[PDB]
Design a protein around this ligand. Structure first.
Ligand code: HEC
Ligand code: HEC
Ligand code: HEC
Ligand code: HEC
Ligand code: HEC
Ligand code: HEC
Ligand code: HEC
Ligand code: HEC
Ligand code: HEC
Ligand code: HEC
Ligand SMILES: [Ca+2]
Ligand SMILES: [Ca+2]
Ligand SMILES: [Ca+2]
Ligand SMILES: [Ca+2]
Lengths: 441, 441
């Protein structure tokens, strides 16, 4: 009884439906690896070294997971590199499948299996109990449609059904805008929050089970990957500490044409409606506030490049240590430091909003990253020395995305061509099947 | 015309005189070396590695400058390690001597020479144009009594006499609460503010004139020493950007018993009068705001110790490279890194208010310090290796202040005995002679 066909709700809720659909204006897909080719090196061996763009409007979540090189070109339902869990934060068909087949049944198999099932845009049933008779009368009836998120919120002592209205607001965004990992043989989504939401707590959670997302193919380090920890970092920042919710900024109360107030569902940049967002609580003018946010952004960006350069050197130094005959036992302490270094950097800047939500916390995390990178590179220079190398390790040319990608051994020409053929041929098949089954208009 | 004898003003200004005098209640003198022995290594070869306490009330300025091991135990007027400029920020007798002898004549010679002349506590004439007929009538008539401070404010585009009242408020504190160095053959106070007040701007200032405060005796690095940059860091923080002045927090407007409003001159912790400081602008309660502040403090403290431990190892590793035969040319790139890492560390935390005034700036500078300390240790590991040394360099025991000080060759028992002798026999000759000459009641 979850309804994933969002247009079902346009007659009854035009103001919310129309502004929801308007995230389709937020369409520029910015190539983040082209903007920062060092990311290719830090993510070598992981699909993020192939393709990683800045987020854009919710209306594109389904298109973007279909089009990313990360999911590749599966030839059938059992094929492709990634599991069903990649659909989880992209569409209300996930809520539909979880209800129909259960959680274990949803997470089983490959991403490719969900192709003709997960087809409606990120939408009403992701955040709302659209089954409640109250929803058609205009009450939000906010709900956690994702059970792993419900279990996470209980782990940090905020069970969602007991939380008040305002805590629940940020928690619906905290279904997806969080750090997570894939746990178990079915690769089910889990947020690593059992020990708390701080970078140190989560690093402790992964280290006590020896978890790794992948092995960096330069340094052979067992690495952790961070993903957009907005819920965690917002909680740590000044706004979170004062109960200023994601909604206060990103879904403000606005007036329709008749003057009736409703929640703006065009989720995007709060600066676009400054008068209804920051000016509700701040007296400073829009340009003054933009300029503060811009300066924190540039401070964080400058420091983040310095930490990435150290890390690029650490991975290439480890690779030269390995080629010189370093044993596993000689590399272990170095790989510990690189893993912890990169984990702190990644978490610090995996959220594109960190300079706004908790800039001090991002700056703190980068400083602790840089401390471990220093340990990695000092250990490495001593190790290379016992192998008779005492000069500076030279880095290949990584000045562009394409050069960084050939240097780590990716055959990009062939990767892109197989993707192109998959988008062209498989996607219309999936849509044809979904329409046939009544899953898509 | 300058009046250094503060008590002169008691009959006319009881509310201000009484609150001013009450700084003598902030009497705890906390030993920062004992809390943090790494400082003794980073400042090895410099007077701060002998004695460094946290600041206490203005009432103690003249006491603390006379009692500090840093000023040694001069036998006569041309003796001792420090110049006249150490008096500059401690007493209104400085304004009297600058007027009487001029700025050059005041700065010429040793600290010891001012001993029988600089005798009255930090007071009225340091911040007030007391000779104005408006002063006796109850108007502040704020003034910059230090001309080097006046040229510094011009240098940052904020001449004092053109500034509004609110800028002038913070400028008075800004005569002393700043980074400075000693310039030229008479060792004149100078604020390195010509290129601006950011860490990077002052770094350029010093590196452009090849200036060094001292040479670290372990690494032989020509080093820069930072001093309490409250004015610079407060300007960088969110309060300074919203024109919340030093005064709004540290010298608030209060009522006397008769209800007349006056400025509390008991300059201290703004949390002691929360209802008249933070509560003027914030609706959070005291416990909540104390908690956010203590949290920033801990964040900066933790990261600071990380950078310090890196810099402790760098200095000892540089010592070991020198002992293993490294030439000046081989040390030079390492020493430049040490100098830059340590400059950014020292400026980041030499203000004890940074976690309140500009916590993100402190954090940012600490992370850039860390980047340079990393480069130093990496180059040092490579250099040590070319000399046949491939093991980690063992550090001596520095777990207490006394152990650290022995490790850098300070005979603390003799230093302390000499100071005690000076405090016992010279201080009273200075005071008796000041009294005889009418300078001290
Ligand atoms: C399984 C490994 C996947 C893959 C292949 C993708 N997702 Fe996600 N995703 C989540 C959130 C909050 C965002 C926007 C915030 C941000 O990116 O900073 C994204 C974005 C995407 C994109 C678009 C941007 C890009 O990387 O190109 C793509 C292509 C993408 N995803 C693919 C949230 C989640 C989850 C919430 C717990 C889960 C699980 C996943 N994503 C899993 C995957
Ligand atoms: C798909 C097109 C829809 C529709 C029809 C609705 N929403 Fe949402 N919604 C979200 C949040 C956090 C709120 C605020 C709840 C609160 O104020 O406490 C709302 C609000 C509503 C309402 C209530 C009336 C209103 O305008 O405030 C209604 C009828 C409504 N919505 C309809 C959150 C989300 C989402 C989070 C990512 C998504 C997606 C949607 N809503 C989608 C829809
Ligand atoms: C709760 C009301 C929120 C808030 C405040 C935001 N989201 Fe999401 N989001 C999700 C994914 C997969 C993306 C990437 C989509 C893509 O690139 O194709 C996003 C993106 C955003 C943004 C960026 C918008 C832009 O124009 O850049 C913003 C500001 C944002 N989100 C805020 C995934 C999810 C969810 C999975 C079902 C849910 C629930 C939310 N987001 C909820 C929220
Ligand atoms: C509650 C946990 C959330 C979540 C899920 C998001 N936000 Fe914010 N955010 C705010 C502003 C002004 C920006 C733009 C920053 C800039 O212009 O430089 C953002 C950014 C984001 C993003 C990234 C968007 C992108 O395209 O990269 C995301 C995914 C995001 N937010 C989600 C403002 C605020 C707030 C102002 C007080 C608060 C509260 C939140 N955001 C909270 C959250
Ligand atoms: C719209 C996107 C914005 C922007 C740019 C900012 N805010 Fe807020 N804010 C609120 C509260 C209660 C505080 C704490 C200080 C206080 O007690 O008043 C803040 C703080 C800030 C800061 C300083 C902290 C920092 O992170 O550097 C800044 C730079 C800032 N804000 C910018 C309250 C609110 C709101 C209440 C519902 C809303 C909406 C906003 N703020 C929105 C924004
Ligand atoms: C302008 C009104 C101010 C403000 C807000 C403060 N000062 Fe000063 N200060 C000076 C010296 C030498 C010290 C150390 C004294 C000692 O330890 O013996 C201080 C100390 C302070 C404090 C710390 C008080 C405490 O209990 O810890 C504070 C909060 C403080 N100052 C604020 C020197 C000077 C000046 C030299 C002539 C001037 C002018 C100022 N300070 C001005 C201000
Ligand atoms: C304007 C340039 C100044 C100057 C010269 C000083 N302050 Fe502040 N400060 C504030 C608070 C709450 C503290 C205590 C922090 C804590 O409780 O953990 C401080 C601290 C200082 C110090 C150090 C005092 C010490 O004994 O260690 C000094 C020398 C100092 N300040 C001087 C609060 C504020 C403000 C609140 C918004 C404002 C503005 C300023 N201070 C401005 C300045
Ligand atoms: C007395 C010691 C305090 C303390 C503990 C704090 N303040 Fe203030 N504050 C003021 C303004 C204009 C802002 C900007 C946010 C906004 O636009 O409202 C702030 C911000 C803060 C924060 C958040 C930013 C940060 O530095 O982390 C915090 C934690 C904070 N303040 C604490 C204004 C004032 C005042 C106006 C005259 C005064 C007084 C204070 N603040 C005093 C304090
Ligand atoms: C331009 C201002 C200025 C100059 C010049 C100056 N001081 Fe200070 N001094 C301060 C301020 C402000 C404080 C308190 C703030 C702090 O120390 O964090 C301080 C604190 C002190 C203290 C108490 C704290 C401690 O370190 O034990 C002593 C002692 C001291 N100074 C000695 C000296 C000596 C010796 C010299 C000259 C080498 C000197 N001062 C020069 C501004 C100055
Ligand atoms: C280190 C700075 C400082 C010193 C020392 C100092 N004052 Fe002040 N005084 C100020 C400031 C700042 C103001 C506030 C000006 C304003 O409100 O704009 C002020 C205000 C005043 C006023 C105006 C009325 C009022 O209370 O606002 C008088 C009178 C005054 N002080 C007298 C004195 C006396 C008497 C002494 C010595 C016992 C003294 N000051 C020492 C800084 C200082
Ligand atoms: Ca975007
Ligand atoms: Ca992860
Ligand atoms: Ca103190
Ligand atoms: Ca200095």
């Amino acid at each position: 009884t979850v309804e994933a066909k969002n247009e079902t709700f346009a007659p009854q809720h035009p103001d919310q439906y129309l502004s929801w659909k308007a995230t389709s204006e937020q369409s520029e897909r910015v190539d983040a690896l082209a903007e920062d080719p060092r990311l290719v090196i830090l993510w070598a061996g992981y699909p993020f070294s192939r393709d990683y763009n800045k987020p854009r409007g919710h209306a594109f979540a389904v298109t973007d997971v279909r089009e990313t090189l990360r999911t590749g070109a599966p030839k059938n339902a059992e094929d492709g590199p990634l599991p069903m869990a990649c659909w989880s934060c992209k569409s209300p068909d996930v809520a539909r499948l979880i209800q129909k087949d259960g959680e274990d049944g949803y997470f089983h198999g490959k991403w490719a299996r969900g192709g003709p099932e997960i087809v409606n845009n990120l939408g009403c049933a992701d955040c709302h109990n659209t089954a409640s008779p109250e929803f058609a009368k205009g009450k939000p009836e906010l709900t956690l449609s994702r059970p792993y998120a419900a279990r996470a919120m209980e782990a940090i002592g905020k069970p969602f059904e007991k939380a008040g209205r305002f805590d629940q607001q940020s928690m619906v965004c905290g279904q997806c805008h969080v750090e997570y990992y894939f746990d178990g043989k079915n690769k089910a989504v889990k947020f690593p929050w059992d020990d708390g939401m701080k970078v140190e707590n989560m690093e402790q959670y992964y280290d006590k089970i020896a978890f790794s997302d992948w092995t960096n193919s330069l340094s052979k380090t067992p690495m952790l990957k961070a993903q957009n920890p907005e819920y965690e970092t917002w909680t740590a920042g000044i706004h979170g500490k004062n109960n200023v919710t994601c909604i206060d900024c990103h879904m403000p109360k606005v007036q329709n044409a008749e003057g009736k107030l409703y929640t703006d569902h065009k989720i995007g940049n709060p600066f676009d409606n400054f008068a209804q967002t920051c000016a509700n609580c701040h007296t400073q003018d829009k340009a003054a506030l933009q300029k503060v946010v811009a300066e924190r952004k540039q401070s964080i960006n400058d420091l983040k490049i310095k930490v990435e350069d150290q890390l690029v050197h650490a991975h290439f130094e480890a690779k030269a240590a390995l080629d010189a005959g370093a044993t596993e036992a000689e590399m272990k302490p170095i790989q510990d430091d690189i893993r912890h270094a990169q984990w702190r950097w990644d978490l610090a800047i995996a959220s594109h909003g960190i300079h706004m939500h908790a800039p001090e916390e991002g700056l703190r995390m980068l400083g602790t990253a840089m401390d471990k990178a220093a340990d990695a590179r000092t250990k490495l220079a001593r190790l290379l020395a016992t192998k008779g190398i005492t000069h500076e390790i030279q880095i290949p040319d990584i000045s562009t995305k394409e050069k960084a990608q050939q240097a780590i051994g990716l055959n990009m020409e062939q990767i892109k061509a197989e993707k192109q053929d998959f988008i062209k041929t498989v996607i219309p098949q999936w849509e044809e099947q979904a329409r046939k089954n009544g899953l898509l208009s």
